[PDB]
Design a protein around this nucleic acid. Structure first.
Ligand SMILES: Nc1ncnc2c1ncn2[C@@H]1O[C@H](COP(=O)(O)OP(=O)(O)O)[C@@H](O)[C@H]1O
Ligand code: BEF
Lengths: 87, 855, 95, 103, 97, 97, 78, 105, 93
DNA sequence: TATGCCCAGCATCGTTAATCGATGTATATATCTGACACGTGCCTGGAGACTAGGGAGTAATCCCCTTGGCGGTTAAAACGCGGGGGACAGCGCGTACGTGCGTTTAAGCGGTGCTAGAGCTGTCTACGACCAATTGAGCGGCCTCGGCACCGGGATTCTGAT
DNA sequence: ATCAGAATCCCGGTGCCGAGGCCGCTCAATTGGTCGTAGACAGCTCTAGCACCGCTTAAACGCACGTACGCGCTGTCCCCCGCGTTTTAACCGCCAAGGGGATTACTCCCTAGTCTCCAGGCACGTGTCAGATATATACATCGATTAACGATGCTGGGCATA
């Protein structure tokens, strides 16, 4: 064809063997089928809040560029202490 | 190791409807299947019930499915037209052209004699095929390769005979020799003749090479910059004795072009490049050195830019002395991986062949200065002094030969701009984006000439109802460059010209792929996606004089990547690719020397947009255009073996020294030692005869003295005395000694084998050269039949006697290591080390043949 | 005698503004007092650390604004920003 | 007073002293206690409103802490805001799983 | 070749991934997805090269621990295959539901 | 007569869900906490309201964690609780040291 | 005095939790859960009490200890 | 001596943490032995952490300390895991914990 | 911009237990941000505790009980011993 | 002339000795990179030194908030017995999931045109803290009575077993 | 389909105690003025990201095959439960009581503020020493080849006898 390239939604970027490897590190022998579809929703709920807090800290600092310290502050606010990238 | 299905070649019918299913493909059609782990010459027409369960079966199922759909698209469809038949049938001859190239070899890599199941050992060649990667290199016996492509076998033997190993290379690192500026051309250009500025450039590169310095070749694109490099390397190897390995990095797109030009101008030098990924790396490593804990069998290779960064340990562990690069604009910034990577290779001299604009940024010129000379070295007011000193400071280390000296044989040059206005779609897509609706910064610059770049754009223009003419009509009228491009394209089609389209965006190339295909315009794209096996077929198809592809699409970096188009003349550019001189180098792929019908260039300048500011910024960066007489024991023994192998060495001594046996000495010393060895040999034979005859006379006197006591009766007849002059005289007749003499420590040196060797080899040279000089494979003997074999395990006739003297005529006596590996004789399984064909056992037979022909 | 501080006669006003016929026990009164003190502690500490991250020496209205936006779940944050900015606007427009 | 000029009910000078004596920042703002008092007034109006409705659900005049528990646990955003909060003298919502019914 | 025991290869992948110190989720889909969600939430935004790593490792933190607790829910349920009710029970006991 | 075993527990749930008072007595709990705190540190005096604080504060955890245990039982297709349900809730919640 | 927590206490706690039928050896480990979850809160109460230079456990130290661990409590001061 | 770090016999800077207490805005007045005490406690913390990190680097035959050595050095201890409960170390991993019932039997 | 980071103050402690091992940059940031985080936890706990008892200052007892609270036992015992030993060493000199 | 007898004639087998070359092993030298210690230069916070005053340590006082016992009785707690719905051992089984395979596709290693934007040093003005005065609200302490707590009696409402 | 039965809700009556409200009075917020100063504003100096480009090359997925595990169902074992029976101590309230938390006053001490330098610390060029990599040179040990020597075996070219 070589006409158009429609990607639909970008939620399909995380495929099956990715979460298969995540569960492989977690310690799961064999998984099911309709698990990664809900897993993307779990990451969505546990992601829109961190992104929202990052946008809030970014907009509050009189700037329109998300840095790295605001992510550490947003994660530490929700009880997810993360090191390595400052703090 | 398994014998499974690899790919599918051809297909036909086996037994001589609306839709044939798989059963009709089983019991009604036979398919040519190519097997894995085997060459393409073993293709057999097999189906499913003739091979059973074999490794790999889905490929033939998918190919047969595409053949079923094809049959549904040939004559089993009421919607097929006329061009679809030429396209679907064109794919047949396309695949045939892509499959017939795998049957003809292209190179012989290695040649190792492997054993079989019957105990015999046959010499098999590592065959390299055409239009294929270094992988899938199967071993083929020497029984059918010489019967299909003898040029590859003869050239493969020429690569081994022409010993150009680095151990013979000179070492002028301590003192450079006397250089002489030549004016004529060396007898190494077998392709064509050269003009004057080519030899001038060669005299400049060799003129600066003798001073231990490096320069930059900054000539015009088309003046033979590649041929000057090959001629400079060949003249440097065969002139200054610099047979060492030389690395020449060439992009992957230009690598086959440099291979064809390299073999067409210098066929005496190999051109084993470096391609592949995994198995081809194993091929280059197994061909690089021998399996031992240092056999350099190469010198000139071609390595891509990505292969350097991917493999730094393999290329970094090898010493180099000369480095050449085409299109050296990649070193624009001194903080790149390639810039620090090329500086890691311990080399001696470098050469930059490019024409990059060294005026927009000082880091480019300075980068090219410290890249080859580590140590050497703003405001507009001080710019006249900075270039007043740096200009003449860099002039002795640069070549600036403009095209004004070669316009006597080139057509005129012209260019016309075209300020194309915007439309309503460009107005709403130019104003409504920076307001509210979206449906960041560079997307406007990309959409400043064509609106079809998002998703909600095709259905917005179509205000009605699948149609075909309305879509193209709404597609051409969306921008002025499409209407004017179609009008100018029609105008050029009313006469007959080859028009090119250079675009930066890769999506616009697909849009033109969907627009020009409906209008019935045959073309082929060229971007950075298809591999070399496809773009090489496309370029080789465009260079045909009867090609129907009057439109050829390119790109920016991929368009101006390399190679050239000779039949193209019209260059249409949609917009400047945000780089000065990038348009000059982009038109340089079509506007060349071979073009005769002039060159017409149209620049579609976007009026009242954002590209004109970038064009002005490109014009702002364009206005700036500123011991020898010492013979040891190993030399006496090695020279003695050279006499036992070649005989007289006063005529081809240059070929007997460069082989690696005779050290670098004076020829007069070899002549004096040869005359002293032959003279002392003849004198030693004369003294051996004068003394031997006297010994025979003494044995005749003592023998007569014994017979006088024997015929009398003083010796008993019951026991015959074995200690008498008669027995020692009979043993003296059958003596087991030779004319030996010690010459300068070296002992056990026969003098009769030297004289008889010069007589036999001289009679062979005069006998062969006096009848067949330019055709040694047609020499005969007539009716001279020697004695038959003495219990040999192989057939031997007169043809073996005629072909047996060819190996002695070419390689010499005692060189049985090359006779058994010579496929031009047929004695593959007739020469071994238990066995009958021995080393000396056959050599004495050759001596009997020579002694039989002399008598 | 110790004069302790508590939000007693400040909540019954808002209580009567929406329910002028209900009451509240002292237990849940202390629950609401400690609730207002707890929210004051969370907003005060959040504005403190947020004022310390940006090297700021003062806490104006935007710090409490983003502290309320980050402390509330959804619509309550928008209503608190509109009502709060309305109260600050009325306080600034007047004396 | 600033509370009467701001048009609110919660105090301004006392919470301002809490911002000064609380030892939080070196300087203080001008409209910070008014904004904070408005937010606390909104939360007070919402919590006391749902507490009044919960009080009317059982025909009771004086609101009990159980009406606060049933008023906070019944909402979604209030339950998300007060997750790890235990109201004194409260209870649980009448939530019984359907799998425990005699069937 | 032959047919290995099903499930043991999974344990071999566990032994290979337990020693890994890098990431498992690819970077380009994560940037294309997170940048799309953040773009739909707020227009005109710019991220940092380190913020992608922080959201990547921080995401895989609860993406691995949550799958560990889910695996515990599958083990306690006398099963070996995870179920959505294990995810729901994990989010219920975790308290972040 | 003989009532159905189980429904009386349900009506006891309906009766206890409406109560707003404690369940464990104050003197046994006062002697337990006073004995443990006495063994931890001698000579200590507590407040009368602290008994209610630790009382209802302990009941909140003994009701939330017990409810999570009940959900762990329902997840396993059973109604009778087991110690592995409490250990599972403590392991998933993360408070299990 | 671990025997003070009788069976009907854990029974009423089970009915408030929402269980139709329980087991047998459950309150025996439940007393251990309450003991582990209680010795740390009491330890914090003795810490805040002893640090206050006075030997009297008030009510604000319990609220501080509960809010420190992440379980806020209202009513008894705050 | 001159600096308080050398007089106290520690390694962490006493003036740095003191200035952080004067600037962090946490108390109106500071003490006299607070930065030395906090510096000693932090010195013990980094001492034990760097010790278990050294062992976590010698058990796998490694020279430099990687974050995985810190992860495996903290997660293996009970009190360190209790202290760093809601803590996620970057560029680390998890403990090789395989259930006994998951083995093929 | 001269940024503040605990760099030379970690080598002096590392060489006293391991004078023959290395350290990466990422793990160095882990240690730095770790000490900063522990400083925020101890300083914040001592700040709120100093505000609870109406205390207008922070001495050594607040850091002592804050250490005894943030640490379950062993680390609190040895941290109190080494801490009081350091305060006594600084006061006596 | 054919058939046994004298005199060479190379290849058959085996054994000795000299020679080119590969393999294994030192042995002092010339690169490669990776430093950790020192001096080069400069920034600047902690320290050499004094102090007034407000929070902090300590003594005498108030009392009231918390401890230790005392009879009665009341709902509350512990044992027990037949038992019936719940938990568990065990088989049928079928559709979803793990296991190979070929092809297209997108993620990854470098480059590359700028360009809106991060940090800050010029500059000062409205923003913010402290000190008199007063004055009106918050809260300490006590009286009223009505919403709600609690019990007796009449509907009432599912509910187990027939 | 149904009927007496324990709980449960509603109506009527008693009755109970603490917030609403009143008296008052204490003191921190309110103005008004003065003194100290923080960061908003434009732009200098860069600066990593906005998009893609060249160019791979391993993976995602549809496809096909095997298979096996929890749902469903069967059958059996079981363990608190409704209810009756037999102990049992917490507490409403009262009583004695006692000593440490809170208050006020006296004293005290040490520290943020201020005035005023100086080597610790940050970045980087320079330097010889751990290891690691060859590298020219020498010595010892064969692998294999070729020239040389001891003994012929028919084979070819001629000499004495049928
Ligand atoms: N000495 C020569 N004589 C004739 N033609 C030449 C010569 N050198 C180059 N050419 C022409 O130039 C073309 C090759 O272009 P080339 O110079 O290799 O491109 P590049 O700019 O990459 O060096 C060939 O088609 C050939 O016809
Ligand atoms: F100008 Be050349 F074709 F590179």
């Amino acid at each position: 064809k070589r006409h158009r390239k429609v990607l639909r939604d970008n939620i399909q970027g995380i495929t099956k063997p990715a979460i298969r490897r995540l569960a492989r590190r977690g310690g799961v022998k064999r998984i099911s089928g309709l698990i990664y579809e809900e897993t993307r929703g779990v990451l969505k709920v546990f992601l829109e809040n961190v992104i929202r807090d990052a946008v809030t800290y970014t907009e509050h600092a009189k700037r329109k560029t998300v840095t790295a310290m605001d992510v550490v502050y947003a994660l530490k606010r929700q009880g997810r202490t993360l090191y390595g990238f400052g703090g | 190791d398994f014998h499974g299905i690899d790919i599918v070649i051809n297909h036909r019918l086996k037994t001589s409807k609306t839709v044939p299913d798989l059963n009709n493909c089983k019991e009604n059609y036979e398919f040519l299947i190519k097997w894995t782990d085997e060459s393409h010459l073993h293709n057999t027409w097999e189906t499913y019930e003739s091979i059973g369960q074999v490794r790999g079966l889905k490929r033939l199922d998918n190919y047969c499915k595409q053949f079923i759909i094809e049959d549904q698209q040939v004559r089993l469809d009421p919607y097929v037209t006329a061009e679809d038949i030429e396209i679907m049938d064109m794919e047949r001859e396309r695949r045939l052209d892509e499959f017939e190239e795998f049957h003809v070899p292209e190179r012989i890599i290695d040649s190792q004699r492997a054993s079989l199941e019957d105990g015999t050992s046959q010499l098999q060649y590592l065959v390299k095929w055409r239009r294929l990667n270094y992988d899938e290199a199967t071993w083929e016996n020497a029984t059918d390769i010489v019967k299909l492509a003898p040029e590859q076998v003869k050239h493969f033997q020429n690569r081994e005979n022409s010993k150009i190993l680095p151990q013979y290379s000179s070492n002028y690192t301590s003192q450079r020799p006397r250089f002489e500026k030549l004016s004529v051309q060396p007898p190494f250009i077998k392709g064509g003749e050269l003009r004057d500025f080519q030899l001038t450039g060669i005299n400049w590169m060799a003129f600066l090479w003798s001073k231990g310095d490096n320069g930059i070749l900054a000539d015009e694109m088309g003046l033979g910059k590649t041929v000057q490099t090959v001629a400079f390397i060949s003249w440097l190897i065969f002139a200054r004795r610099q047979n060492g390995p030389h690395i020449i990095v060439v992009p992957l797109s230009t690598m086959p072009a440099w291979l064809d030009t390299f073999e067409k101008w210098a066929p005496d030098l190999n051109c084993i490049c470096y391609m592949g990924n995994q198995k081809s790396r194993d091929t280059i490593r197994e061909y690089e050195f021998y399996t031992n804990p240092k056999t350099m069998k190469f010198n000139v290779l071609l390595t891509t830019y990505e292969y350097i960064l991917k493999d730094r340990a393999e290329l970094g562990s090898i010493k180099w002395q000369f480095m050449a690069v085409d299109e050296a604009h990649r070193l624009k910034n001194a903080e790149s991986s390639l810039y620090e990577s090329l500086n890691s290779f311990k080399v001696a001299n470098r050469m930059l062949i490019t024409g990059t604009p060294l005026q927009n940024n000082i880091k480019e010129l300075a980068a090219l200065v410290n890249f080859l000379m580590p140590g050497r070295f703003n405001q507009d007011e001080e710019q006249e002094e900075y270039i007043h000193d740096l200009h003449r400071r860099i002039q002795p280390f640069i070549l600036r030969r403009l095209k004004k000296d070669v316009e006597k044989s080139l057509p005129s040059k012209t260019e016309r701009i075209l300020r194309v206005e915007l439309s309503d779609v460009q107005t709403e897509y130019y104003k409504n984006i920076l307001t509210k609706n979206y449906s960041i910064m560079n997307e406007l610059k990309k959409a400043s000439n064509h609106p079809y770049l998002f998703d909600n754009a095709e259905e917005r223009v179509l205000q009605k109802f699948m149609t075909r003419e309305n879509v193209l009509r709404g597609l051409i009228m969306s921008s002025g460059k499409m209407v004017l491009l179609d009008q100018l394209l029609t105008r050029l089609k009313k006469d007959g010209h080859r028009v090119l389209i250079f675009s930066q965006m890769v999506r616009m190339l697909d849009i033109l792929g969907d627009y020009l295909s409906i209008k019935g315009i045959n073309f082929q794209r060229l971007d950075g996606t298809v591999p070399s096996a496809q773009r090489r077929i496309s370029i080789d198809h465009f260079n045909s004089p009867d090609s129907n592809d009057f439109v050829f699409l390119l790109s920016t970096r991929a368009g101006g990547l390399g190679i050239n188009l000779m039949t193209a003349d019209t260059v249409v550019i949609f917009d400047s690719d945000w780089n000065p001189q990038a348009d000059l180098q982009a038109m340089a792929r079509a506007h060349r020397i071979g073009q005769k019908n002039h060159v017409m260039v149209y620049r579609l300048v976007s009026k009242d947009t954002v590209e004109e500011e970038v064009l002005e910024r490109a014009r702002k960066k364009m206005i700036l255009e500123y011991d020898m007489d010492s013979i040891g024991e190993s030399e006496v023994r090695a020279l003695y073996k050279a006499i036992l192998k070649f005989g007289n060495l006063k005529e081809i001594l240059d070929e007997l020294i460069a082989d690696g046996t005779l050290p670098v000495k004076s020829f007069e010393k070899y002549g004096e030692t040869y005359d002293e060895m032959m003279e002392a040999a003849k004198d030693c034979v004369h003294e051996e005869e004068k003394n031997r005859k006297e010994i025979l006379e003494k044995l005749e006197k003592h023998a007569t003295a014994y017979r006088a006591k024997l015929k009398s009766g003083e010796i008993k007849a019951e026991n015959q005395p074995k200690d008498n002059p008669l027995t020692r005289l009979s043993l003296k007749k059958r003596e087991k000694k030779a004319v030996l003499f010690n010459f300068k420590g070296v002992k056990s040196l026969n003098a009769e084998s030297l004289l008889s060797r010069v007589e036999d080899l001289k009679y062979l040279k005069n006998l062969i050269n006096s009848n067949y000089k330019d055709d040694p494979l047609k020499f005969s003997l007539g009716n001279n039949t020697p004695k038959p074999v003495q219990n040999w395990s192989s057939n031997w006739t007169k043809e073996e006697d005629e072909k047996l003297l060819i190996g002695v005529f070419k390689y010499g006596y005692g060189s049985w290591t090359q006779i058994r590996d010579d496929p031009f004789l047929g004695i593959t399984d007739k020469i071994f080390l238990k066995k009958v064909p021995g080393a000396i056992h056959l050599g004495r037979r050759v001596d009997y043949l020579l002694s039989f022909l002399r008598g | 005698k110790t004069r302790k501080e508590s939000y007693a006669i400040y909540v019954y006003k808002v209580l009567k503004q929406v329910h002028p016929d209900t009451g509240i026990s002292s237990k849940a009164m202390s629950i609401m007092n400690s609730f207002v003190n707890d929210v004051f502690e969370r907003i005060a500490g959040e504005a403190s650390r947020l004022a310390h991250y940006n090297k700021r020496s003062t806490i104006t209205s935007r710090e409490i604004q983003t502290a309320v936006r980050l402390l509330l779940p959804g619509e309550l944050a928008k209503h608190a920003v509109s009502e709060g900015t309305k109260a600050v606007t009325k306080y600034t427009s007047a004396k | 007073t600033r509370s009467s000029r701001a048009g609110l009910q919660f105090p301004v000078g006392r919470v301002h002293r809490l911002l000064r004596k609380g030892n939080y920042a070196e300087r203080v703002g001008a409209g910070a206690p008014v904004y904070l008092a408005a937010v606390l007034e909104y939360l007070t109006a919402e919590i006391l409103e749902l507490a009044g409705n919960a009080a009317r659900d059982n025909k009771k005049t004086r609101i009990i802490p159980r009406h606060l528990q049933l008023a906070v646990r019944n909402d979604e955003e209030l339950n998300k805001l007060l997750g790890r909060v235990t109201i004194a003298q409260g209870g649980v919502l009448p939530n019984i799983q359907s799998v425990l019914l005699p069937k | 070749p032959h047919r290995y025991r099903p499930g043991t290869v999974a344990l071999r992948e566990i032994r290979r991934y337990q020693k890994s110190t890098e990431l498992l989720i690819r970077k380009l889909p994560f940037q294309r997805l997170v940048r799309e969600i953040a773009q739909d939430f707020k227009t005109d935004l710019r991220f940092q090269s380190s913020a992608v790593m922080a959201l990547q490792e921080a995401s895989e933190a609860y993406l691995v621990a949550l799958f560990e607790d889910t695996n515990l829910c599958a083990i306690h349920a006398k099963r070996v295959t995870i179920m959505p009710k294990d995810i729901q029970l994990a989010r219920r006991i975790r308290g972040e539901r």
